């Protein structure tokens, strides 16, 4: 869950750290040409019958994704979203369509390969 | 504080929204024993006394540095390597080194990058 405000200690050597801030940059996020591994934490909401290789079963659902390879609208939008994550981050995401149907899902970016 | 969890990102033009609800970092995201990092010291340290440090210090801040792990020569620097090895790039943390004397040395670091 929360990282900022966390404490780490090596009591044997008198060392302590308290996180007071987190500032991520484009440098820490997946790029347009990256390959990532991510998780889907539960069934998506309002996916309807929309085709997706990644969204839908048992959870979490693990995946590997090479950016630029997706073939469906939903997957393409999920690439763009994942490109705004940092490895280790879980986020509640949505895609709202031209009709106003919103698809809801929860992802974790595990790593940038 | 500079929080990330709870942060919201939007691409309104294309109907995309994201809300960070958790962060889980692992040893894989932190500097290793053989890494080279770039970090910042945000202000003068407290109670450094006169202990030697290449990195710690009425100069102007922030102070920028590059550190090849395992090259430090002073107790304070060596302990600062160990501490930095518990950061993720982008993290600012209030750190301390407490000696046997019972006294604590305080400083504020930001890990900027793993080279």
């Amino acid at each position: 869950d929360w990282y900022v405000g966390t404490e780490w200690e090596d009591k044997n050597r008198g060392l302590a750290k308290k996180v007071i801030g987190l500032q991520f940059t484009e440098m820490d996020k997946p790029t347009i040409i990256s390959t990532v591994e991510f998780s889907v934490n539960k069934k998506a909401t309002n996916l309807g019958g929309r085709p997706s290789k990644y969204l839908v079963a048992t959870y979490p659902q693990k995946h590997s994704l090479e950016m630029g390879t997706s073939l469906t609208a939903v997957d393409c939008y999920l690439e763009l979203l994942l490109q705004q994550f940092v490895p280790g981050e879980t986020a509640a995401c949505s895609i709202t369509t031209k009709t106003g149907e919103r698809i809801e899902f929860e992802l974790k970016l595990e790593k940038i390969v």
Side-chain angles (χ1 to χ4, degrees), chain A:
Chain A
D1 245 317
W2 302 96
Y3 187 64
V4 163
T6 56
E7 296 165 29
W8 175 87
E9 280 199 73
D10 178 341
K11 279 215 141 45
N12 288 304
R13 289 183 295 185
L15 303 175
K17 172 183 89 127
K18 183 190 183 69
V19 181
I20 59 174
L22 271 184
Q23 283 292 121
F24 298 121
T25 82
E26 295 309 282
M27 303 309 299
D28 308 313
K29 304 175 176 170
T31 59
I32 189 175
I33 307 298
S34 55
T35 295
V36 294
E37 297 171 5
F38 68 105
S39 292
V40 183
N41 287 351
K42 62 180 180 295
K43 64 179 180 180
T45 297
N46 207 14
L47 177 61
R50 280 175 255 281
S52 178
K53 273 159 94 163
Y54 308 115
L55 295 189
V56 162
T58 190
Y59 300 85
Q61 286 277 308
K62 304 293 241 228
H63 293 300
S64 176
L65 169 63
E66 180 179 342
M67 302 292 180
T69 63
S70 297
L71 305 166
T72 80
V74 169
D75 296 341
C76 289
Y77 280 144
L78 177 139
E79 295 193 2
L80 290 177
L81 279 161
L82 279 173
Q83 279 175 234
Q84 322 307 324
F85 281 62
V86 308
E89 155 189 3
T90 302
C93 304
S94 51
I95 297 168
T96 302
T97 56
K98 283 158 211 104
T99 84
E101 299 295 280
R102 182 172 66 198
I103 304 69
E104 309 154 8
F105 45 98
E106 202 183 275
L107 301 173
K108 176 176 179 187
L109 181 56
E110 321 218 299
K111 42 160 66 93
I112 306 179
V113 180

